[PDB]
Symmetry: D2
Subunit: 115 residues, 4 copies
């Protein structure tokens, strides 16, 4: 599991369940190609997006579909989605945890990078 | 005015208005003595808490009554209040707080 | 000026100065077209990006070049940049970003 | 484990290891009495502070000793510590995760409350 996403809801003090996450990788022609996608579990975690073999060096974008999440709760939020863009594995394989904390008008994101 | 407080609401995307703020300074006996207080304005700001003369080096606590704020909006919050504790050293302090029911963040902007 | 950007540095407790910001609007073909840009001032602020006439309803992206900022301070950052994507609907927008090497937070303050 | 603390470092993108945490409970005479204390592990987590039996209703304060953490890294930080104060178990036992994300001039805290 070299790439894991964890999403929390700051309004309810709970994991953010069933949030859609789409991951893209920047291709040789500077286009974002689809890489992986999934939905957060009841623990607000998304595991198994990729493998070490497939997760090569590159620029990745993790798009978290926050708008759909808040709308399904009857809240009209500010952002369309939360986007996290980073270079990965540029000095060898690392494990990446991307965490996001969500509110209707704000969000925070962090990365925990281990090896 | 060397100390300013700004409070924002992350749920509504607005200044947090009418939020009570109490400032304390740590006394000789390790007690917190009341120092300054007020309620944030329409812009979520609290200006004029103190003066350069009075704002001597020391340890200060800024207590933001976040519970009352959320209760007024009909939302059940987690925290009793938010506290920011820091040392003022000489060499302007903006204490900002961003509020959600189960989370808050605070940052200090120290300028000049 | 219906759109303002403010950027703060959580490592140094200061405005984030000289940070390039690019604003894009989503075009008819789902493309991002350049809309406005600038560099934050000494107060970490970027004013005068647009006018009420030009700032029509639509989807906008604000891209903050956080990587260059951290590189200038000799700190290796995680993110390529920070992006804030939102719909402007009619019924002033302050987009604030708080920057650390491996983390950032952004909040919108929508007033009037 | 009804009370867990997790602390992350936003400067290094790593868990915050060896951070001291002191927990207090408000006593009948409105004094803060010591309740539990510990240090975060290599994963930035602190488990085993208390038991369900001991963790009764009350107002608790979780003090995270952030100043010592940053000083040991050669950074002179703004805050003396981060404090999280909350009523616990007021409608029955809950499990509380207190998370903090740390930077020298800022911090964020969240609670995940489950049952
Ligand atoms: O003027 C300000 C505006 Cl607009 C926002 C913040 C601010 C404060 C905190 Cl804590 C945040 O997490 C974010 Cl994202 C912005 C601070 C100042 Cl000083
Ligand atoms: O397990 C975790 C828990 Cl509980 C909380 C956060 C987490 C994530 C964000 Cl964005 C935060 O601002 C804070 Cl304070 C904690 C991260 C992980 Cl990985």
């Amino acid at each position: 599991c070299p790439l894991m996403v964890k999403v929390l809801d700051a309004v309810r003090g709970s994991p953010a369940i069933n949030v859609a996450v789409h991951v893209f990788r920047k291709a040789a022609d500077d286009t974002w190609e689809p890489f992986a996608s999934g939905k957060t579990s009841e623990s607000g975690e998304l595991h198994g997006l990729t493998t070490e073999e497939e997760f090569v060096e590159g620029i990745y974008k993790v798009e978290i579909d926050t708008k759909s999440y808040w709308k399904a709760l009857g809240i009209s939020p500010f952002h369309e989605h939360a986007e996290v863009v980073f270079t990965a594995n540029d000095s060898g394989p690392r494990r990446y945890t991307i965490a996001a904390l969500l509110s209707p008008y704000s969000y925070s994101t962090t990365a925990v990078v281990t090896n």
